[PDB]
Design a protein around this ligand. Structure first.
Ligand SMILES: *C[C@@](*)(O)[C@H](CCCNC(N)=[NH2+])NC(=O)[C@@H]1CCCN1C(=O)[C@H](N)Cc1ccccc1
Ligand SMILES: *[C@@H]1O[C@H](CO)[C@@H](O)[C@H](O)[C@H]1NC(C)=O
Ligand code: NA
Ligand SMILES: [Zn+2]
Ligand SMILES: [Zn+2]
Ligand SMILES: [Zn+2]
Ligand SMILES: [Zn+2]
Lengths: 250, 39
């Protein structure tokens, strides 16, 4: 996260850290949507060009983590994966269309003050909150700038950007399965997700029922926090049926 | 939306943080989002 701030303790209890098992290496972010299901970016799991094609056993996830250097005994939880599900129509060759994947934990985790799931949007919530100008929140342990890495989870709030403006900021082919967010050069504020923030959640607090909902997944961008450029996120609501199909399948 | 038996738990106890919403406490930047809703 570039130009962000430290997150307070327990501010993002659905925050998940995706790790490479051997050798241990932080790879991406992810989010906890239930006691056993974790959402993340497909490219975090499958991106052949970067020699990424992980199997359940190549990875570990850490939940409720406050520091990346030490182990909070009975606070942070390390879980193994039972199964990985990548969207079948994920286009890694071209524009990362449908950059979404689900991972089922081997054993469900107990919720605590530091571990709790984020909500997934319903039709009504998505309609009223997913509008240009409305701000969301992105969190992550990724790079502090185009490069280093933070010792505390980072956070930044960013406005959703109108489609036409997103489309003009890049020549990469944008789809309805993506939305972008970030401040315009003229808005005077900065901030963006960056390398290794992929998979992290872009969340919005519903003023209605006071619950946090995951609207997007950090997916891609060109550089980090550059003027006239915006971060792209997987449009979660648009792909909820696939999520339903997968979770209600297995 | 989700069958509890597959989803697990959480559908009904999501998006409410123990250390914030559960204690009626606002985090330090949350108001920025609320204000972005206000026109
Ligand atoms: C995997 C993630 O860590 C990462 C998140 C990037 C978020 N960046 C900003 N500014 N919010 N994604 C990437 O690194 C992805 C993976 C594939 C390459 N990529 C890119 O962002 C490229 N820089 C651009 C791109 C390449 C191919 C298809 C779409 C975009
Ligand atoms: C993933 O690795 C498996 C071999 O272990 C391979 O069959 C599959 O085609 C790979 N997925 C690709 C490269 O998209
Ligand atoms: Na920008
Ligand atoms: Zn500091
Ligand atoms: Zn290749
Ligand atoms: Zn701690
Ligand atoms: Zn609870």
């Amino acid at each position: 996260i570039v130009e962000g701030s430290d997150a307070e303790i327990g501010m993002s209890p659905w925050q998940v850290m995706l790790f490479r098992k051997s050798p241990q290496e932080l790879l991406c972010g992810a989010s906890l949507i239930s006691d056993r299901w974790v959402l993340t970016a497909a490219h975090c799991l499958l991106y052949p060009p970067w020699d990424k094609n992980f199997t359940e056993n190549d990875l570990l996830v850490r939940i409720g983590k406050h520091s990346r250097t030490r182990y909070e005994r009975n606070i942070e939880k390390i879980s193994m994966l039972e199964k990985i599900y990548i969207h079948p129509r994920y286009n890694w060759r071209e524009n990362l269309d449908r950059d979404i994947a689900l991972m089922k934990l081997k054993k469900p985790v107990a919720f605590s003050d530091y571990i709790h799931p984020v909500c997934l949007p319903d039709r009504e919530t998505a309609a009223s909150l997913l509008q240009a100008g409305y701000k969301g929140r992105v969190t992550g342990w990724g790079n502090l700038k185009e490069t280093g890495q933070p010792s505390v989870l980072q956070v930044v709030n960013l406005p959703i950007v109108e489609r036409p403006v997103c489309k003009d900021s890049t020549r990469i082919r944008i789809t309805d399965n993506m939305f972008c967010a970030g401040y315009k050069p003229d808005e005077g504020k900065r901030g963006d997700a960056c390398e290794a923030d992929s998979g992290g959640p872009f969340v919005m607090k519903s003023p209605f029922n006071n619950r946090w909902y995951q609207m997007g997944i950090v997916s891609w961008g060109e550089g980090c926090d550059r003027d006239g450029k915006y971060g792209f996120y997987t449009h979660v609501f648009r792909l909820k049926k696939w999520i339903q199909k997968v979770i209600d399948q297995f | 939306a989700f069958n509890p038996r597959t989803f697990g738990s959480g559908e009904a106890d999501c998006g409410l943080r123990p250390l914030f919403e559960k204690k009626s406490l606002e985090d330090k930047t949350e108001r920025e989002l609320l204000e972005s809703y206000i026109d």
